[PDB]
Design an enzyme around this catalytic site. Sequence first.
Site, PDB file in Angstrom:
ATOM      1  N   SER A 163      28.351   1.134 -37.377  1.00 23.14           N
ATOM      2  CA  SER A 163      27.509   1.234 -38.591  1.00 23.14           C
ATOM      3  C   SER A 163      26.131   1.798 -38.204  1.00 23.14           C
ATOM      4  CB  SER A 163      27.411  -0.149 -39.280  1.00 23.14           C
ATOM      5  OG  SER A 163      26.961  -0.080 -40.634  1.00 23.14           O
ATOM      6  N   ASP A 255      35.003   2.280 -48.199  1.00 21.95           N
ATOM      7  CA  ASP A 255      33.738   2.134 -47.472  1.00 21.95           C
ATOM      8  C   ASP A 255      32.838   3.264 -47.973  1.00 21.95           C
ATOM      9  OD1 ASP A 255      31.644   2.365 -45.514  1.00 21.95           O
ATOM     10  OD2 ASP A 255      32.923   1.579 -43.929  1.00 21.95           O
ATOM     11  N   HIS A 285      34.093  -1.707 -45.347  1.00 21.56           N
ATOM     12  CA  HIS A 285      33.156  -1.771 -44.226  1.00 21.56           C
ATOM     13  C   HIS A 285      33.128  -3.168 -43.609  1.00 21.56           C
ATOM     14  CE1 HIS A 285      29.949   0.344 -42.131  1.00 21.56           C
ATOM     15  NE2 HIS A 285      29.250  -0.782 -42.111  1.00 21.56           N
TER      16      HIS A 285
END
Length: 314
Positions: A163, A255, A285
Site C-alpha cells: 500500500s 480495491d 484492500h
Amino acid sequence: SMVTQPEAVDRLDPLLRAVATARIDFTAESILTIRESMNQRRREAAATETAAAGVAVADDVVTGEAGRPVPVRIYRAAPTPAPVVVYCHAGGFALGNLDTDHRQCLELARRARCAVVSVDYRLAPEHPYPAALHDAIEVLTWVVGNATRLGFDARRLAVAGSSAGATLAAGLAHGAADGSLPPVIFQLLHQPVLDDRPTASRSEFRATPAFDGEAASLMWRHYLAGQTPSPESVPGRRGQLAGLPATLITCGEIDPFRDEVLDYAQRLLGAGVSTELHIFPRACHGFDSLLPEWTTSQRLFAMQGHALADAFYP
C-alpha cells in the site's frame, strides 16, 4: 452509522466478507483513534506470530545526524551473508509501526529465505512528504553501509512494501535506477498506492470496506500537505520507467488502487522492465491482513516468496 456501512460486499469471498464489515474513516481525528487501537492489537498479535514462524527477529535503530533514529525490525531466515529486503509497511502514510505488517515480513523472510529490514518511518499528517521517504532512504543506506557487520549480501538487495509503504519502496527503486542509491535487484509492490490522480476504480470503490476511494483522496491530502504532486512524491506520475528493477506487483480486484496498479504494470512492461503481475479475485484492500490464513492470502505469500527467491537464488 450508515456512512460506515461498506459497499460491494457481495463481490468479496464470503470468508473475507465476514471480516470486511466496515469502511475506514481517514480524517485526521479518526487517524489518531485508529493508531491507538490498531497498535495495541498488533503489539499483542506480533509476539504470537514470531513464536510460530521460527524467524529470528531483532529491533534496532538507525540513528541519524540530527540525533533521533529511525527504528527498524530485522528478520533473519537465512545464513550470513543473507540476501536482504528493505520493507515499508501499509497504513496510508498516516498509520502503523513495526507491528503493522509483522506477519507479512515473517512470511517474506521465511519463504524467500532472506533477511527483511522493516522501516518504522515517520507519519503524516505530522510528518508529510518527504519525511517517510527520507527515513526509508536512511535505512536502505545503513543496510548497505553496514552489510558486513549485519550479515547481509548487499549485491542481493530488494525493496518491498504494501500500500502506502509500496509507494516508498517504489521511491527507493527509482533512486537505485537513477544511481542516487545503491543498486536494487528487485522490487515487490503489494497493493501499491501509486497515483493521486483519480481512476475509474477509485470512484467505483469509493466506499468499499477496509480502504476506499474517499479515504484515498484524504490520504493523498495528508501526505502531500499542500505540495504540488510530482514524480518524486507520486511514482505513477513518472514518465520514464525504463531501467527500474524487476517487479512483482499484486492487488485484490475490489480495491480502489486496482486501476493504478494495472496502469503502472502495463507501463513497466512497455518500458522493458520484467514484471510479474497478479490481480486476486473477490478480495478487497488489505485482504492478507484481514485473513492471513485464507487460501487466497496464502497464495499471495507463496507468490511473493517465490518471486524474491528466484531473484535471490537464480
